[PDB]
Write a protein that binds this DNA or RNA. Structure first.
Length: 232
DNA sequence: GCTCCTTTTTAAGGGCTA
DNA sequence: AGCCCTTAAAAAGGAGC
């Protein structure tokens, strides 16, 4: 087994913060790490350098906003076959073979204003590469179930609009499926003293066979928590 | 270099018109 | 049913030592 990690880092333009991210990731030791909200521009990708993770695939915009990265451990032979990247910086997709078992990874950062519905259209734009071995991860900035929110408000209609799009592509929320009754959160809103789980691991139903654990990890690096997934 | 203050950015209720 | 303005606290920016 292989480990997948998701973290909304909330800005990486500080050099001290890049150092702390480097040390945290070596601490966690994932096989693949997905970072959202790096805030690195198109010409600033080489500032992001972790030792032990030399394959670092990025999609960036032109402003110190958005930005996604997929980091691949040096301890796994990951031989990539396709790389599609938005040049606004909101998603990157990587297909390859970790431990020679095929896999697709889509790393998405949805803007909070109109989030679930940017995600629906992103799935439709990358339709033709979506498989039976996908993981979708990142800052969805939307809850998917009423359990993803401390106010427990009923779900947006357009989240039911995405849940259909996930279910018609045979994808499930991996975290919810392994903990259908669990309330643990990835974001605390200090202005409202609310909690929410707006960051997600979504995956092919077919790979649910292969998933052992999914953890929510506290950290001193960002105002979001991280999601860890050990596969098999 | 460095310290310290100012401005921007971001997720989310809570009120309320088309 | 969905938008606008506000909120707090960090990220990004900048004046001045």
């Amino acid at each position: 087994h292989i480990t997948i990690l998701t973290l909304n880092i909330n800005g990486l333009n500080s050099a001290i913060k890049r150092h702390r991210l480097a040390s945290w990731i070596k601490s966690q030791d994932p096989s693949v790490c997905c970072i959202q909200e790096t805030h690195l521009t198109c010409r600033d990708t080489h500032r992001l350098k972790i030792k032990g993770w030399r394959k670092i695939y990025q999609a960036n915009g032109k402003q110190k906003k958005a930005g996604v990265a997929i980091l691949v451990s040096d301890k796994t032979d990951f031989k990539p076959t396709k790389i599609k990247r938005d040049k606004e910086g909101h998603y990157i997709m990587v297909k390859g073979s970790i431990q020679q078992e095929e896999l697709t990874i889509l790393n998405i950062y949805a803007p909070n204003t109109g989030a679930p519905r940017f995600i629906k259209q992103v799935l439709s734009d990358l339709q033709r590469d979506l498989d039976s071995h996908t993981l979708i991860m990142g800052a969805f900035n939307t809850p998917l179930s009423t359990l993803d929110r401390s106010t427990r408000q009923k779900v947006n209609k357009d989240t039911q609009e995405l849940n259909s799009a996930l279910h018609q592509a045979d994808l499930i929320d991996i975290y919810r499926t392994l903990h259908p009754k669990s309330t643990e959160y990835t974001f605390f809103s200090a202005p409202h003293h609310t909690y929410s789980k707006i960051d997600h691991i979504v995956g092919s139903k077919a790979l649910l066979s292969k998933c052992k654990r999914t953890e929510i990890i506290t950290n001193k690096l960002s105002d979001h928590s991280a999601i860890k997934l050990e596969l098999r």
